[PDB]
Design a protein around this ligand. Structure first.
Ligand code: HEM
Ligand code: HEM
Ligand SMILES: CCN(CC)CCc1cc(F)c(F)c(OCc2cc(C)cc(N)n2)c1
Ligand SMILES: CCN(CC)CCc1cc(F)c(F)c(OCc2cc(C)cc(N)n2)c1
Ligand SMILES: C[C@H](O)[C@H](O)[C@H]1CNc2nc(N)[nH]c(=O)c2N1
Ligand SMILES: C[C@H](O)[C@H](O)[C@H]1CNc2nc(N)[nH]c(=O)c2N1
Ligand SMILES: [Ca+2]
Ligand SMILES: [Cl-]
Ligand SMILES: [Cl-]
Ligand SMILES: [Gd]
Ligand SMILES: [Gd]
Ligand SMILES: [Zn+2]
Lengths: 402, 402
């Protein structure tokens, strides 16, 4: 049982939950790979299905009960008859929340108990995918009062194709290569943008052109769908006191909706299960806008601020970054779109760690992803030792469908 | 294969083949990563000594030579007769440099080949130890043109106590436990302060009182030595444009000199081997001055700056911390004391990683310590995946001698 210290306060806890780590991570006694982003029949499915049901009934305080034993024999006969099994809607809701609760890299898990689960397991064809996704977006956007939600499309099953959303997020800005070698728009999205062009989309030429959706029903090629502009809430960026910031023409979208991760519950796998919450401001103002391989606007903002950019020790990068994050915070609040700054978010995650220590003896957390990308040690999570491990139900990365 | 390591700013990948040579085990297992935790004999000596000798003769491009073979046999014979051995002078110099090169939490390792190595293995008393330490401080400080140096005191041997420096650094400010439970001075140093008082030091009552040294000769209680004030170079802190900042009365010292780690070379252990370089500004400006459990000046500086400290979303913490780092850099530069900002230091560490990929096929590096505590993703090391593992020669933590 690892001893976990907080160095700001001196408090000690022991993570007993890590003993339940169901799968293996990338680290060994010889070498730690915790900084790597991506770190690498019937009998099998049944063991995982049995374990999840025991979790579920333990969590509702009905373990070993009558309904408990009936579900166990239900899934057994289902898998024997069909080779898979279907979750009850309540088990689906429970598994979706747990998979969020178990995500080590998510700082927003204080909210894990409040998640809207939309059951799309009866979906067929991409046109119905698009309708489910639009309803998700409208519900989750909620005119700027953002609400967490997930939509769960049909599970993988043998002999059949997969439901897949080709886009990594529901809202993504295009990235276009030039013959001067550079990218106009989001360099992260060059590949998906040319796929959209290949699959019928006629491309714009702005820095913030919202990509279409490439939706794939089983065994059919992906279908191109355009999101109605009225559906896609965006926030033009301005600064409270730097009047010229608006003129930079920056903007971001309201809804962070990850659409390319795989949801695993009780040995079942959902390759299409997009989820959304609301943004932490550093995601936009630090990573999306200031990463050198993304919009990379830091020097543009610094020149507008008349900073000394030819010596590092003036901390011009640090001052420009802060004001960009100020602008993001100011603009979302002014537009009445839900946002949380990195101080408030890390303070809530500390409370989450305390809640989770009592609830199950630990919390899997990935320090490198929890600590914000600016002002790390100014937040309480920097001084908190953490233990990273994999629990199920879970979200997992997965190969691109192409 | 070996671990694949990606740089996300550039898209380039390397493979760390050096990690496969890791000797001592770390804290991680396939079940759980503990990378975020701060603190996690004949035949064994010979293997370590032989490997070290092999390292030495590799470094001078004389592997497999007569001299190489004869030195291995010479080490073998001395271990056979005495259970231990003595390093040649050249080996001690090479070994100390390798221990710095191998230190995974050090971002300053571009400098690893430039290290002044003081051989104090003939030290016999705490008085002689103090003279060696004063020579080190004078050499390394060099009136502000700092020079990296290490002084190596006698190795551990059977039947005689160790040399130890009780202080964690050669220069530290007193932390006086207040009757309230608060601290005046540096809270990190309350324990060593109380040990100095208990050992006869007449304490001061300021926030920046330089501590005396408690030096331990073999099988002796520690002895108290006052550093001559002219030996301890300090920098008054001021801000280039916030003239009230000087009135805070803040100072820091020039010389970062770690004195409580154990240097291990070829199986031999040197429990006293203080080493020094020069500061990276975030150590002083972010951690030492803004940690809640250290000098904790952030709110005070922000209030003086007339920032709105009642809402986290103004980013008043980030703005005040940036200016405090500016003050540190400005004040060291004004005083003509070597200092490196976190942008320049991390850019040079990227160069080090590239040199080491070519020289050795990898580099042990602890991402959470290499990424600076403000402005993390504005530096290139944030986007560099890293592999953490233990090579020898090494600097190691060791128990406090009390
Ligand atoms: C409600 C507000 C939320 C906030 C503020 C938030 C914040 C974050 C942040 C900052 C990250 C790091 C990702 C990055 O740096 O790109 C992250 C990762 C993650 N989030 Fe949350 N999130 C929220 C809601 C959710 C919800 C509703 C789910 C699922 C139901 C979720 C699941 C995940 C997962 C699986 C990851 C890890 C993916 C990865 O490795 O990057 N989050 N979150
Ligand atoms: C020359 C300029 C140098 C710079 C700018 C530098 C920078 C740093 C920094 C910023 C840290 C993290 C310290 C902390 O947060 O507590 C560190 C750790 C470390 N440094 Fe360097 N360093 C330098 C020289 C040296 C030298 C000369 C040695 C040894 C010969 C050394 C050995 C170490 C070791 C072993 C650690 C890890 C200690 C730990 O685990 O806390 N450094 N260094
Ligand atoms: C693959 C390349 N990187 C950079 C684009 C991916 C980063 C990333 C990968 C994932 F899998 C994620 F779920 C992810 O969630 C960000 C997020 C999600 C939610 C619901 C809320 C929020 N506030 N934030 C972020
Ligand atoms: C022990 C409590 N914290 C903060 C005092 C970490 C202590 C610490 C222990 C070590 F072994 C270190 F090598 C260390 O390196 C600081 C450092 C060292 C050198 C040579 C240069 C530099 N620029 N910086 C710092
Ligand atoms: C190499 C490193 O793991 C990579 O850049 C990580 C570090 N920490 C992160 N933290 C968050 N929240 N998001 C990220 O994308 C990353 N990227
Ligand atoms: C708990 C966490 O590991 C701890 O606060 C670490 C994080 N990274 C660090 N990095 C450096 N350079 N120095 C430190 O003291 C720490 N502290
Ligand atoms: Ca051309
Ligand atoms: Cl994003
Ligand atoms: Cl220090
Ligand atoms: Gd101007
Ligand atoms: Gd002024
Ligand atoms: Zn690890």
């Amino acid at each position: 049982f690892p001893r976990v210290k907080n160095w700001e306060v001196g408090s000690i806890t022991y993570d007993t939950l890590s003993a339940q780590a169901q799968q293996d991570g990338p680290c060994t006694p010889r070498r730690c790979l915790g900084s790597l982003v991506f770190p690498r029949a019937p009998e099998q499915l049944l063991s995982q299905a049995r374990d999840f049901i025991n979790q579920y009934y333990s969590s509702i305080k009905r373990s070993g009960s009558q309904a408990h034993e009936q579900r166990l024999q239900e899934v057994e006969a289902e898998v024997a008859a069909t080779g898979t099994y279907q979750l009850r809607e309540s088990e689906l809701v429970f598994g979706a929340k747990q998979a969020w609760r178990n995500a080590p890299r998510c700082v927003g898990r204080i909210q894990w108990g409040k998640l809207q689960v939309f059951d799309a397991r009866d979906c067929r064809s991409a046109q119905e995918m698009f309708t489910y996704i639009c309803n998700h977006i409208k519900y989750a956007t909620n005119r700027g009062n953002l609400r967490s939600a997930i939509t769960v499309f049909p599970q993988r099953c043998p002999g059949r194709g997969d439901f897949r959303i080709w886009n990594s997020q529901l809202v993504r800005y295009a990235g276009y290569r030039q013959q001067d070698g550079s990218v106009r728009g989001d360099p992260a999205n060059v590949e998906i943008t040319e796929l959209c062009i290949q699959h019928g989309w006629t491309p714009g030429n702005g820095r913030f052109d919202v990509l279409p959706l490439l939706l794939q029903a089983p065994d059919e090629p992906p279908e191109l769908f355009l999101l109605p502009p009225e559906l896609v809430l965006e926030v033009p960026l301005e600064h409270p006191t730097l009047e010229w910031f608006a003129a930079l023409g920056l903007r971001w979208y309201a809804l962070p909706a990850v659409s390319n991760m795989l949801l695993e519950i009780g040995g079942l796998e959902f390759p299409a299960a997009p989820f959304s919450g609301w943004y932490m401001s550093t995601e936009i103002g630090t990573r999306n806008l200031c990463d050198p391989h993304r919009y990379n606007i830091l020097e543009d903002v610094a020149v507008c601020m008349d900073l000394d950019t030819r010596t590092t020790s003036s901390l011009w990068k640090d001052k420009a970054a802060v004001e960009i994050n100020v602008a993001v915070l100011h603009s979302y609040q002014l537009a009445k779109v839900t946002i949380v700054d990195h101080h408030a978010a890390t303070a809530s995650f500390m409370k989450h760690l305390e809640n989770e220590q009592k609830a199950r003896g630990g919390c899997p957390a990935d320090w490198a992803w929890i600590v914000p990308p600016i002002s790390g040690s100014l937040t309480p999570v920097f001084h908190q030792e953490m233990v990273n491990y994999f629990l199920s139900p879970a979200f997992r990365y997965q190969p691109d469908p192409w």
